Structure formats: structure tokens, C-alpha cells
Design a protein around this ligand. Structure first.
Ligand SMILES: *[C@@H]1O[C@H](CO)[C@@H](O[C@@H]2O[C@H](CO)[C@@H](O[C@@H]3O[C@H](CO[C@H]4O[C@H](CO)[C@@H](O)[C@H](O)[C@@H]4O[C@@H]4O[C@H](CO)[C@@H](O)[C@H](O)[C@H]4NC(C)=O)[C@@H](O)[C@H](O)[C@@H]3O[C@@H]3OC[C@@H](O)[C@H](O)[C@H]3O)[C@H](O)[C@H]2NC(C)=O)[C@H](O[C@@H]2O[C@@H](C)[C@@H](O)[C@@H](O)[C@@H]2O)[C@H]1NC(C)=O
Ligand SMILES: *[C@@H]1O[C@H](CO)[C@@H](O[C@@H]2O[C@H](CO)[C@@H](O[C@@H]3O[C@H](CO)[C@@H](O)[C@H](O)[C@@H]3O[C@@H]3OC[C@@H](O)[C@H](O)[C@H]3O)[C@H](O)[C@H]2NC(C)=O)[C@H](O[C@@H]2O[C@@H](C)[C@@H](O)[C@@H](O)[C@@H]2O)[C@H]1NC(C)=O
Ligand SMILES: *[C@@H]1O[C@H](CO)[C@@H](O[C@@H]2O[C@H](CO)[C@@H](O[C@@H]3O[C@H](CO)[C@@H](O)[C@H](O)[C@@H]3O)[C@H](O)[C@H]2NC(C)=O)[C@H](O)[C@H]1NC(C)=O
Ligand SMILES: OC[C@@H]1[C@@H](O)[C@H](O)[C@@H](O)c2nc(-c3ccccc3)cn21
Length: 602
């Protein structure tokens, strides 16, 4: 017979229905199953008709693996999936959340909070475009981004993954989506999924919904807010995502007024699917269904029932697929979960796969490998890093000479601090490892390296990680650049009730600035206690987590470009004020949202 679903000339909806009508229950449940590459094998993928794989943070074929190595890995998995009776290609997902960040040599862009500081949605679109190319360079078709959380309390470990505490800024930055996926057609119906083809990736608006509104910024916790507030703060950017054809939505670990998002049929089915008319696929977070219960995983039968009935389509298991498949099969065999629900989930998954061209181009393009770390993308990251910087102070009194921009020609200068020559620290979490890491973890340019690359050949650059006061006073320095701040973190490991930077940091700034005029570069995922750093410093720059291209920092320090970044978040006076956001009745910031000093290019 002619087999319609294999015909690339046929409409997506026709292809979906034709394929769905041929599938066994095992093949359907297989599509709904996403597994870690760490548990995948050719036989496993074939035997269980697996629909998707992912790499979690740090889940890589080997350290320092080339783009070709990633392609060969993904293709090996694909070959197994293509060998099934129906030959449904798998989709491979990864957290490419500031570039293709798990991958050695990938361009690392500034994290979201810094991007928010740029107020430049077209810049963010261009980052999406570059990111899609670097993800496809590694054979991967699906990025778990953007995080469109609206972080309402910086004690949250994922505050850096949020563009802003102001939903309007988060809404504007949804331009990442058509960057990653391609621009939607003129005819486009809001809520339909879209990916332009083999040089773009499926995107993922996450985490639905209110992940940024949890009590005291406790990760995965309870968001206590009325429906009006949920809809006014936490929801708006999802509608922009629908308008831009986001292919997938990932559900949050968090709860809304005590109801787990992973079990919330009202929001997932009633609102996202039935009201916003979302027609792509809904994916769980990692063991997100396990975490419906207390303790997590204590009633996995319930977890599967609750989540699938709530409206989730694909489960990021990611390890215990046999248990998942067995339990879901049993619920269906028993009539507890209707075939209509399974058919809906599979319809949505297949719709995304056919739409994005996956059946036509299931394998990697070796000619794309060279896109990884491409200099043009690094130039873009450098632009973004520079634009993200917020100048908080530029002179100790209203009558001092402005310190910035600094002269490129001086007899001798000092570069100091724990963050001056630490690529891992300047990238933060979700870089190479899940939690990020310390030192030279990838290809990039540290602040020290950037200074050396910028200054006149006659200027002597001295590096001292933690010099004492006497070293500085006796050094004959013209000025110093001192870089300090937070260590890399991700998710719960980043939750922090005190928001004070690790030492040595302040002590180094005090030692250096006490001896010579100093520009302090603060590397952080969020506002942190800053008055003492301010008091010591002639100038102070909030650089956020600027990524691999440290020359973005020096581009502004030395006046190649003027500072333009503006705070995308409130800077608090103390943590006991928190939560405190723009528009609050009680609003007493150290620096308001939108604050930022400027300079002009030399
Ligand atoms: C304000 O709250 C913060 C969050 O609660 C808190 O930071 C956390 O402190 C705890 C300890 O109280 C840390 O847990 C331990 O981490 C040890 C190793 O920590 C180093 O490596 C990790 C990455 O693996 C970094 O994230 C850390 O920052 C730290 O980095 C090292 O720091 C040195 C000093 O600056 C540097 O010289 C050094 O170069 C640098 N090294 C690296 C690799 O960058 C582990 O060995 C411990 O076992 C412990 O781990 C925990 O074990 C219990 C388990 O429940 C936890 O899940 C597990 O994490 C934690 O890492 C840290 N969180 C961060 C930074 O994200 C602040 O504490 C301050 O900083 C810490 C690091 C200590 O210096 C404290 O003495 C200090 O108080 C809180 N600040 C205040 C004022 O109270
Ligand atoms: C010395 O520095 C100052 C301060 O940065 C420069 O003035 C700024 O110039 C910006 C760029 O031209 C102005 O931004 C624009 O503002 C308009 C009006 O709101 C807006 O419609 C534009 O989109 C743009 O806004 C930016 O868009 C990109 C975002 O990422 C960014 O966050 C937005 O700010 C800005 O308003 C202006 N600021 C002030 C206080 O005047 C100044 O530049 C000089 O003057 C401006 C007005 C303009 O005519 C420039 O061509 C001109 O160079 C700069 N001076 C020099 C000599 O470089
Ligand atoms: C929001 O976060 C709080 C704080 O982490 C969560 O409450 C905590 O819930 C855990 C279990 O999920 C409790 O752990 C248990 O502690 C008791 C101690 O008697 C012990 O018997 C158990 O073995 C287990 O370890 C923990 O006590 C509790 N913490 C506090 C201080 O209340 C809360 O569940 C989170 N809410 C949401 C919606 O996620
Ligand atoms: O990496 C896959 C997803 C990612 O896309 C989500 O944004 C994020 O919430 C997340 N946390 C874990 C994860 C959490 C705890 C242990 C192991 C893994 C896994 N993931």
C-alpha cells in the first residue's frame, strides 16, 4: 500500500493521523517516553519504541568531545529508532540555555538576567539563531529553552535564568523562540508548533507556571498567589510563546497554592491546551512526576496516573523507563487512562516531529559541525556581554574624575580577584557541567586575558589573585581591575538566604582599592549584598554571568563602547526586605529596576 505518513509532500495533520492509526499501544507509549542517553542502548531504543532522548547537564559522550563525536552519538541512537517497524525518528533534547553549553568549545552567551539588562530583544533573537546552529552542529534537534520564569525573589537559585522580575521584559525576550526555531509564517495560528527545518531546533517555554514565584525563592516549592496575580505576572510570557509558535512547554516542579504543577489538570489541560490553544507537546521536568508525592517516587503508579491525566504528553523519566512504560501500559489496559488521552499525547509529539522536518532529516549534517564555537557567534556573545553590564558607580564623590573608561596606555596596571582569571566562574551554572565548574573548562577569554588583549603593548599587566594591601601600595600601579563574586550554581544548590559573596572577595576589593584607584567587576547571577563593595570601590560594574567572551567586559572598561545596560531586577538594601519588586507598595531599593549609569565611547 501507499503509506501516507512517509510522504513528505502531505500536510502534517494528515501525516500525524495516518501514523497514529497504525500504532500499537507499545508504540504509542514509547513516543511518550524520554530517556537519558546514559540508559540508552540500540536494543532499548528499538525494543521500547522510545520517542526521545536527552542529555541532562554534564551528560556528554566524553570530556572534550568534538562536534562530530556528538553527531555520531546522536546518529547511533537515531539508527536504532529508525530500525523499528514504523521507523519513527527520536527527538534529542538538551539544555542549550546560554549557547550549546554542555559542549566543549561551544560559544557561551551571557545568562538570562544579563540579557534582560540589555533591553535588546533583537540581540536575544540573534543569540537564539546562533544557538540553534551550534546545537545542530552537535546533531541535536531540541533545546530546553527559553526559561521564561519571572523571578520574584533573588534568593532563588535560578534567578539568573530569568530575564527579569518584570514580566514585560520577560515577554519582550521571548524573541529567543523565533531565533531558535525560525520566524513563523504570515498565516500563523497562535499555539501551533513551528520549526523552520534542519538548521533550526525545537524550543521549550519553561517551566509552566510560576516557577519564579515560590515562597522565599525556595526552588521547586510553593507559589502562593491568587489567580489574578498568577495571570498578571507568571503567565503573560506563555501567551507570547504561543504567538511565536513555541514547539514544546515543560512543566514546573513547583506548586501553585499547594497543587503540584505536574498534577494540575486545570492549568495544563484547562488553560494551556484548552484556552491558549497550545498544540505542541507538554513535557515533564526530570523525575517531575516522581516529585508529585512526598517522599518523591513513593507512589509511582499515582505519579503516572496524576501526570498523564493532568495532560502531560512526554515524560522525562529519565532513567527508569521500564517501570514507566509498564505502569502506563497497565493503567491503559485497566481503563484508568483512556485511549483518547494517549492518542492526544502522541498526536502532539508526532505533530512537532513532522512539523520540524524530523522524518525528512532524522540524521545529523556533518557540514554543520564547523558552526560550533564559530568566531561570528563569539563576536555576538561579546556584544551581548558588553551590553549586559550595568555600571553602578563611577567615582566616589560627585566631584571625582570618572574612573571609567580606563586608559589602554599606562605604565603598570593590576588585575586581581578570584574571578579575574576563571573562565568557569564567569560562565556560572549550566556550563560543561550541570552546576558549572571552576577554571578553564572550555574555550574562552577570561577578564585577565581580555585586559592583556586590550591594553597598549607598553602597559605592564600584573596579575595577583589575592594581593595584600602592601603589595598594591608598593606596586607602582596606575589603576586596578578587581573581579569577584558568586561561584557557579544551578537549581537548588543556588538557593541562598544571605546573598553575600564568598570570601575572599570583599577583602580583596578592600585591599586593592585601598592602595590604588579600582574598578570592581562583580560576577553574580543576581543582586547580592553590595554596600561594602561599593564603599571600597571607585567604580563598580554588575557583570552578571557574562559567558565565554570576557572581552565584552573590557570593551566597556576601556571605552571602546559606552555602558548602556540597565538593572532588570531591583537591587535590595538587605535580604530582610525580600521579596521586594518594582511596583510594590513598600519599595525601598538600593538601586531601582532600570537603574544604570552610562559612559561614552572614547
Ligand atoms: C550564604 O548561603 C550560601 C548558600 O546556602 C552559602 O554557600 C554555601 O555554603 C555551603 C557550606 O556552608 C557549601 O556547601 C559545601 O560546599 C563544599 C565545597 O564548596 C566549594 O565548592 C563548591 C562547588 O563544588 C562551591 O559552590 C563553593 O562555593 C565552594 O567553592 C570554594 O570556595 C572557596 C572559598 O571562596 C574558594 O577558595 C574555592 O576556590 C572554591 N572552590 C570551587 C570548586 O569553586 C563541600 O565540600 C561541602 O561538603 C558542602 O557541600 C554541601 O554539603 C551538604 C549538602 O547538603 C549540600 O547540598 C552540599 O552543597 C555550598 O557549596 C555553598 N553554596 C554555594 C556557594 O553556592 C554561604 O556560605 C559561605 O560560603 C561557603 C562556600 C563557605 O565558605 C561558608 O563558610 C560561607 O559561610 C552563606 N554565607 C554566609 C555568610 O553564611
Ligand atoms: C553618550 O551616552 C549616552 C547614554 O547612553 C547616549 O545617549 C543615549 O543614546 C542611546 C542610543 O542612541 C539612546 O537609546 C535609544 O533611546 C530611544 C528613545 O527612548 C529608543 O527609542 C531607542 O531604541 C534607544 O533605546 C535603546 O535601545 C536599545 C536598548 O538595548 C537600550 O536599552 C535602549 O536604551 C538613549 O536614549 C540615549 N540616552 C540619553 C539619556 O540620551 C549618547 O548618544 C547620543 O545621544 C542619543 C540621544 C542619540 O542621538 C545618539 O545618536 C547620540 O550618539 C552618547 N553620546 C555619544 C556622542 O556617543
Ligand atoms: C517547601 O519547602 C519546605 C522546606 O524544605 C518543604 O517542607 C519539608 O518537607 C520535607 C519532605 O518533603 C520534610 O522532610 C521530612 O522531615 C521529617 C522531620 O520530622 C522527617 O520525618 C522526614 O523523613 C523528612 O525528612 C521537611 O521536614 C519539611 N521542612 C520543613 C522545614 O517544613 C515543603 O514540603 C516544600 N513545599 C513544596 C510545595 O514543595
Ligand atoms: O536537564 C533537564 C531538566 C532541565 O531542562 C530543567 O530546566 C531543570 O529543572 C532540570 N533539573 C533537572 C535535575 C534535577 C535534579 C537532579 C537531576 C536533574 C533536570 N532538569
Amino acid at each position: 500500500d501507499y503509506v501516507l505518513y512517509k510522504d513528505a509532500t502531505k500536510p502534517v495533520e494528515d501525516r500525524v493521523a495516518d501514523l497514529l492509526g497504525r500504532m500499537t499501544l507499545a508504540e504509542k507509549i514509547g513516543q511518550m517516553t524520554q530517556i537519558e542517553r546514559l540508559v540508552a542502548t540500540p536494543d532499548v531504543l528499538r525494543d521500547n519504541f522510545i520517542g526521545s532522548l536527552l542529555s541532562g547537564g554534564g551528560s556528554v559522550p566524553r570530556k572534550g568531545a568534538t562536534a562530530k563525536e556528538w553527531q555520531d552519538m546522536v546518529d547511533g541512537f537515531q539508527k536504532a529508532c529508525m530500525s523499528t517497524r514504523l521507523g519513527i525518528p527520536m527527538i534529542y533534547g538538551i539544555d542549550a540555555v546560554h549557547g550549546q553549553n554542555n559542549v566543549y568549545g561551544a560559544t557561551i552567551f551571557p545568562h538570562n538576567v544579563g540579557l534582560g539588562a540589555t533591553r535588546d530583544p533583537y540581540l536575544v533573537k540573534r543569540i537564539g539563531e546562533a544557538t540553534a546552529l551550534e546545537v545542530r552542529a552537535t546533531g541535536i534537534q531540541y533545546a530546553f529553552a527559553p526559561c521564561i520564569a519571572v523571578c520574584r525573589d533573588p534568593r532563588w537559585g535560578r534567578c539568573y535564568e530569568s530575564y527579569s522580575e518584570d514580566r514585560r521584559i520577560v515577554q519582550s525576550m521571548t524573541e529567543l523562540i523565533p531565533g531558535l526555531q525560525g520566524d513563523v509564517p504570515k498565516d500563523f495560528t497562535s499555539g501551533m508548533p513551528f520549526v523552520a527545518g534542519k538548521n533550526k531546533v525545537a524550543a521549550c517555554a519553561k517551566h509552566f507556571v510560576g516557577d519564579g514565584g515560590t515562597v522565599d525563592g525556595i526552588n521547586e516549592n510553593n507559589t502562593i498567589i491568587n489567580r489574578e496575580g498568577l495571570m498578571n505576572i507568571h503567565m503573560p510570557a506563555y501567551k507570547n510563546a504561543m504567538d511565536k509558535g513555541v514547539s514544546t512547554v515543560m512543566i514546573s516542579y513547583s506548586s501553585w497554592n499547594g497543587v503540584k504543577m505536574h498534577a494540575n489538570q486545570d492549568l495544563v489541560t484547562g488553560y494551556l491546551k484548552d484556552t491558549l490553544k497550545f498544540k505542541g507537546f507538554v513535557i515533564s521536568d526530570w523525575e517531575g512526576i516522581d516529585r508529585i508525592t512526598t517522599p518523591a517516587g513513593s507512589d509511582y503508579s499515582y505519579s503516572v496516573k496524576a501526570s498523564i491525566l493532568a495532560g502531560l504528553d512526554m515524560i522525562m523519566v529519565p532513567n527508569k523507563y521500564q517501570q514507566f512504560i509498564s505502569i502506563l501500559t497497565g493503567h491503559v489496559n485497566g481503563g484508568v487512562i483512556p485511549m483518547s488521552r494517549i492518542d492526544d499525547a502522541v498526536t502532539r509529539i508526532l505533530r512537532v516531529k513532522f512539523t520540524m522536518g524530523l522524518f525528512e532529516n532524522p540524521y545529523a549534517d556533518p557540514a554543520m559541525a564547523e558552526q560550533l564555537g564559530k568566531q561570528e557567534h563569539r563576536d555576538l556573545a561579546r556584544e551581548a556581554a558588553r551590553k549586559s553590564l550595568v555600571l553602578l558607580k563611577n567615582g566616589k564623590t560627585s566631584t571625582d574624575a570618572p574612573l571609567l573608561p580606563l586608559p589602554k596606555k599606562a605604565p603598570k596596571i593590576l588585575v586581581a580577584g578570584s574571578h579575574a582569571d576563571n573562565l568557569g566562574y564567569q560562565c556560572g551554572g549550566w556550563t560543561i557541567e550541570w552546576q558549572g565548574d571552576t577554571g578553564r573548562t572550555t574555550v574562552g577569554t577570561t577578564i585577565l586575558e581580555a585586559v592583556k588583549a586590550a591594553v597598549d603593548p607598553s602597559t605592564v599587566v600584573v596579575f595577583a589573585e589575592n594581593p595584600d594591601a602592601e603589595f598594591v601600595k608598593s606596586g607602582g600601579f596606575s589603576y586596578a581591575i578587581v573581579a569577584v563574586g558568586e561561584h557557579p550554581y544551578t537549581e537548588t544548590k543556588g538557593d541562598n538566604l544571605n546573598l553575600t559573596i564568598p570570601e575572599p572577595g570583599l577583602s580583596t576589593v578592600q585591599a586593592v582599592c585601598g592602595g590604588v584607584r579600582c574598578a570592581t567587576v562583580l560576577i553574580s547571577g543576581r543582586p547580592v549584598v553590595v554596600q561594602p563593595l561599593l564603599a571600597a570601590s571607585d567604580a563598580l560594574v554588575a557583570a552578571w554571568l557574562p559567558g565565554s567572551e570576557g572581552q565584552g567586559v573590557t570593551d566597556a572598561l576601556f571605552g571602546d563602547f559606552g555602558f548602556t545596560g540597565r538593572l532588570p531586577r531591583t537591587w535590595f538594601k538587605s535580604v530582610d526586605q525580600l521579596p521586594m519588586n518594582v511596583g510594590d507598595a513598600h519599595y525601598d531599593p538600593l538601586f531601582r529596576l532600570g537603574y544604570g549609569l552610562t559612559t561614552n565611547a572614547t
